[PDB]
Structure formats: C-alpha cells, structure tokens
Curated annotation (Swiss-Prot), chain B:
Keyword hit for Transmembrane: no
Record-given protein name: Thymidylate kinase
CC terms in the record's Gene Ontology section: cytoplasm; cytosol
Pfam families: Thymidylate_kin
Reaction(s) catalysed by this chain's protein: dTMP + ATP = dTDP + ADP
Length: 194, 193
C-alpha cells in the first residue's frame, strides 16, 4: 500500500513520515520511506541540481518528474508488488501546488505529467499536513531557513483546493505538537490500515 | 532563425551541422550550434547521466526534455531575439522518433511535452538526414560504434512518418558523400535564406 505525505516546507512531513515509518515497522509491516526529489541514486543527483541551480520553472518541473519516474520504476512499483507499505515525503499534489498554483504552470498539464511519471500509480491515502505559513516559517526559522511567504500562501491555498477536488486526501492539522499531529495521522490511517 | 537537423545515428548530422555553421559564419551570419542533450551547463550534466546510467524510457524522455527546456530558455530564445541563426544537432522530431516510434511511448504525449519544453518555438526548417540503417551501421562500424538495427529500423520509419505529417521537414538523401549531401542541404535552405 501507498501513503503520500504532502504539504508546505516547515509542515513537519519528514519528521512525521519517519515517525510513521518506525511505528508501522514495529507493528510488523514491511515499509519503505522515500523523499521527493531523490530516493534513488539518479533521483538524488537531480535533488542536488534542484537545490543548488537557478532553474526556470519548466526545467524544474521536468526534473522533479524525472526523479519521480526513476523512483516509481526502480522502487515503488516493485515495493508495492511485494506488499510493502510505501511512505512518501512529498508526491503528486506537491508538484501541482508548487509548480501550478505557485509558479503559474497549467494544472491539467502537470496532472498529465504526474500520470506519466507514476504509470497511473495513485496513493491509497494522501495526508495533507496543513499549517499556516507564518507558523511554518517560524519553524524553518529555527533551523536558519527562510522561505518566501508570498509564494507559500499561494502554495497552501493550492493544497487545500486539491484536498477538496482530489480523491483520498485527508487534511491533517499540522500546526499542533509532534505527538498530537502523529495521533491525528494514525486516526486518518485507521480507515485504511490496522 | 532556427535550423534543426534530425535523423538516425550514422546519418552525418554533426558533420553537416558543423559545415552549415562554418559556411553561414563565412557568409556573414551570427550563428549558434548546439547539440541535444547538452548546450548549457545543466544540460551537459544531464547528458552525462543519459550517456552513463541505466534508465527506463520515461525517465529518459523527461531528462531529454529538461535539457531542451534549459537550452531553450537559457540560449535559443535570447539567440533568436538577437537574430542569430541557431543550428541544432537533433531536436523535437528525434525525441518523437526515438522515444515514440522506437521505445513505444505515446507520440502525441511526446509532441505535447516537446511543445512545453520549447515554449512553442518551432524551427523555420527541419533537415531530416535520411539514410538506410545498413549504411548508417556500415559507417558507424568504422568508428567502432554498434547500434541496434531492429531499433533503428523502427526509428527511421518514424522519422519518415513525421516528415509526411509535420510542417517544414525536407527529407535529405543522406546516403551520399559529404559534399553532395551539403549541396542538397543548401538547396533545401535557399527557400529560407
């Protein structure tokens, strides 16, 4: 089965994805955890490019999608075939929210590109870790990271739109404390898991 | 203006494109010559990846297009704005022929992806350097290069298919010698220069 975390920077996706990883492992599921971009050797070099270079939004989109494609074919599809629980730190909604609602590219094109990269593989559940931008920024600030408030407001709105429009998306209040947010995730998953 | 060379490996694309580059620089055009993938800093690192790694066809297409996207935005578009002649060794038809007709991805999807990567920038003329695979192989074989005849036969058919339906594609009999092929390309280019 496939569980996708989605959300803005500073929403705690990496921390909560790791928590979910360790928790399901101990309950006896076989589980993988991958981040996007990255999660494969080729994906990780592309992650370095995406993090360091000055890329236009179109080239940036195609590289995100190339990383995803590599991950889907190299790991996710085989993992899923062997009944692993696959947990993603970011997936197809983030691409639409960032490149579409944020950077202005066409949403329907992004979805078609998403479908191509994924071979139609969709999550069993998508966890949207929703958080206000100022609170997300204040947390990032604690690690000396500064992201763009104007950009992230559009991205956040994108996410909440997509959670209405798209299938199997649960909105998690990610402004809470680490444990309370995890508990809320577990409840949203109980209608698909253990 | 934008001049694109297309065709299978062994058709002499690079040789002809360099000849065209040298010729037009002599006759007083400001010209650019780029290869795909490549031609920008980022696009050359993606070329390295494409030339080394074991890649599925979907990842490969997406990386070809990312290189193209970079080259288009960084260089082709500005170059064209200042009336440079941009010559390309491989372009959008090669992606369709290779990834679509060759490896079986959807041709219509590839077209749309090309359209996105290029911002709708189309060549003024496309020179398809058509050659039989046997002859392309015979020529490649004398550089210690070996390519798949089965694969390349499909890709040739694809290229010729595209020449019939797509706009501004002149089919150049690239089976000839270097100078007679270049003479044919110049004939084809008189109707735009």
């Amino acid at each position: 089965m496939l569980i996708a975390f989605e959300g803005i920077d500073g929403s705690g996706k990496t921390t909560q994805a790791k928590k979910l990883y360790e928790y399901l492992k101990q309950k006896g599921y076989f589980v993988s955890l991958y981040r996007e971009p990255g999660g494969t050797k080729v994906g990780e070099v592309l992650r370095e490019i995406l993090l360091t270079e000055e890329l236009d939004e179109r080239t940036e989109l195609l590289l995100f999608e190339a990383s995803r494609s590599k991950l889907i074919e190299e790991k996710i599809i085989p993992d899923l075939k062997r009944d692993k629980v696959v947990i993603l730190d970011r997936f197809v909604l983030s691409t639409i929210a960032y490149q579409g609602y944020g950077k202005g590219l066409d949403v329907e094109f992004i979805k078609n590109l998403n479908e191509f990269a994924t071979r139609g593989v969709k999550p069993d559940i998508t966890l949207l870790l929703d958080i206000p931008v100022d609170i997300a920024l204040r947390r990032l600030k604690e690690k000396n990271r500064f992201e763009n408030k104007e950009f992230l407001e559009k991205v956040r709105k994108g996410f909440l739109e997509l959670a209405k429009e798209e299938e199997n998306v649960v909105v998690i209040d990610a402004s809470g404390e680490e444990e309370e947010v995890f508990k809320e995730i577990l409840r949203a998953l109980s209608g698909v898991l253990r």
